[PDB]
Amino acid sequence: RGLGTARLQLVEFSAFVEPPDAVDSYQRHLFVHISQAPPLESVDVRQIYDKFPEKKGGLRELYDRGPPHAFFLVKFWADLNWGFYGVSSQYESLEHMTLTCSSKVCSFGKQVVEKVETERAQLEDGRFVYRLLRSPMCEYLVNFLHKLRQLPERYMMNSVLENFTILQVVTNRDTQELLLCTAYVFEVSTSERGAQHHIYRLVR
Amino acid sequence: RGLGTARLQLVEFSAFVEPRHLFVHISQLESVDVRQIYDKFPEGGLRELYDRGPPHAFFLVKFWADLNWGFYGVSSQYESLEHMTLTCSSKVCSFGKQVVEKVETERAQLEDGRFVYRLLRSPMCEYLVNFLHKLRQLPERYMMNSVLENFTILQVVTNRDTQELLLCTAYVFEVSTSERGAQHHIYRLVR
Numbered sequence: 394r395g396l397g398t399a400r401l402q403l404v405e406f407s408a409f410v411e412p413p414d415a416v417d418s419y420q421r422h423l424f425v426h427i428s429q430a431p432p433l434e435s436v437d438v439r440q441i442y443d444k445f446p447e448k449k450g451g452l453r454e455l456y457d458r459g460p461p462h463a464f465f466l467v468k469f470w471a472d473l474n475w476g477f478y479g480v481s482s483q484y485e486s487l488e489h490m491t492l493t494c495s496s497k498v499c500s501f502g503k504q505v506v507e508k509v510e511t512e513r514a515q516l517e518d519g520r521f522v523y524r525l526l527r528s529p530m531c532e533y534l535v536n537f538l539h540k541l542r543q544l545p546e547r548y549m550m551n552s553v554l555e556n557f558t559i560l561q562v563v564t565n566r567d568t569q570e571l572l573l574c575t576a577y578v579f580e581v582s583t584s585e586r587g588a589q590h591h592i593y594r595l596v597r
Numbered sequence: 598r599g600l601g602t603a604r605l606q607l608v609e610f611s612a613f614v615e616p617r618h619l620f621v622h623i624s625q626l627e628s629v630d631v632r633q634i635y636d637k638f639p640e641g642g643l644r645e646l647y648d649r650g651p652p653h654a655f656f657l658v659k660f661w662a663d664l665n666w667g668f669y670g671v672s673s674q675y676e677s678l679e680h681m682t683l684t685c686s687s688k689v690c691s692f693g694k695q696v697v698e699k700v701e702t703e704r705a706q707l708e709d710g711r712f713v714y715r716l717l718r719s720p721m722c723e724y725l726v727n728f729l730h731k732l733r734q735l736p737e738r739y740m741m742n743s744v745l746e747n748f749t750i751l752q753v754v755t756n757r758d759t760q761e762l763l764l765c766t767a768y769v770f771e772v773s774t775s776e777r778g779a780q781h782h783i784y785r786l787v788r
């Protein structure tokens with residue numbers, strides 16, 4: 394129903410830029426942003442197998458590892474109409490864990506870059522909270538965004554983006570239980586609408 | 598010396614597969630000159646950190662790894678006399694572009710009158726494991742080594758609470774013959 398499970402819920406995610414004068418008037422531009430009773434639509438995981446990095450830690454093996462209900466697809470309409478480039482994430486749990494979070498970027502389904510961080514829990518009002526705030530976006534991505542934003546046509550941006558995906562894998566560090574696996578696929582939004590997203594479940 | 602400084606020493610390093618097989622192992626010095634490897638790392642690149650100082654913290658290790666052979670694991674273990682919290686960062690680089698960065702932290706455990714920092718059984722990142730299988734199916738040691746001339750790992754341990762760098766190891770890689778096993782050579786990075 395949302396992006397997450399009973400063990401680990403994604404509270405918030407966002408990738409952004411603050412211009413170098415934000416020390417005078419603060420502003421931040423959101424490339425993409427998720428903030429968090431229908432059930433969610435489904436998408437068949439094999440239909441995107443080729444879009445993620447096969448052999449090991451790619452989609453098929455991860456799904457085979459399960460649990461099957463931990464897998465969500467997120468379709469992003471990015472706002473490229475806008476410095477410090479950042480990513481922030483916030484998850485929450487009933488149990489106290491140490492999370493490992495991996496972010497794999499893949500071009501044409503080949504694992505281009507991978508960031509991996511650990512995050513330990515901080516108590517809160519009835520919940521454990523895990524905050525990975527203001528991760529500085531790696532400059533592969535900032536460069537790709539700059540090159541991408543100067544293309545002359547939306548449809549060209551979207552054909553480029555059809556090869557660019559991101560796989561996020563959150564696991565328990567101690568036990569290696571997979572908690573959350575998210576495939577992201579990307580399209581650019583028209584000027585006037587901001588960023589927007591549609592979350593699906595990955596079934597088989 | 599060994600691999601370390603007065604504030605922090607490497608006691609154990611091992612990269613292994615269990616079905617245990619050890620690709621590389623250190624258990625516990627001539628100067629190599631840092632510019633000689635500048636073209637091997639990004640430019641987050643080694644010159645940045647070396648300028649940051651302290652240059653007595655920077656080391657180079659050359660591994661001759663053993664690929665003759667699951668769970669793919671990395672275990673490091675450090676030592677200190679001050680109670681610290683380490684941030685250990687690995688960066689795997691291929692052809693100078695940084696293709697993975699893995700970031701962990703370990704807080705000090707008291708033991709035998711010293712502090713041990715044990716980062717044991719990190720799942721080897723998936724890039725490295727795919728790389729290892731591909732590398733292993735090659736038919737000649739010289740082909741492995743040609744491949745491996747473009748692959749390097751860079752480790753920066755820093756004090757978490759202060760951001761001081763404490764340690765900085767560049768790793769370079771070749772394969773050894775089926776007879777000889779793993780071997781390695783630590784070097785001071787100077788300039």
Ligand SMILES: O=C(c1ccc(F)c(F)c1Nc1ccc(I)cc1F)N1CC(O)([C@@H]2CCCCN2)C1
Nearest residue numbers: 408424425471480496498506507508530531559577
């Ligand atoms: O910025 C991101 C990122 C992560 C997940 C996600 F769903 C995104 F949309 C992300 N950003 C992003 C990607 C494409 C466009 I067009 C706009 C965006 F805002 N990340 C993952 C990150 O950590 C990478 C992983 C690989 C190495 C480190 N940088 C930074």
Ligand SMILES: CCCCCCCCCCCCCCCC(=O)O
Nearest residue numbers: 612620671687699721722748749750
């Ligand atoms: C640099 C390309 C790969 C080198 C191939 C040699 C085989 C042994 C690998 C040792 C890696 C040790 C550090 C890895 C950190 C991680 O777990 O990502």
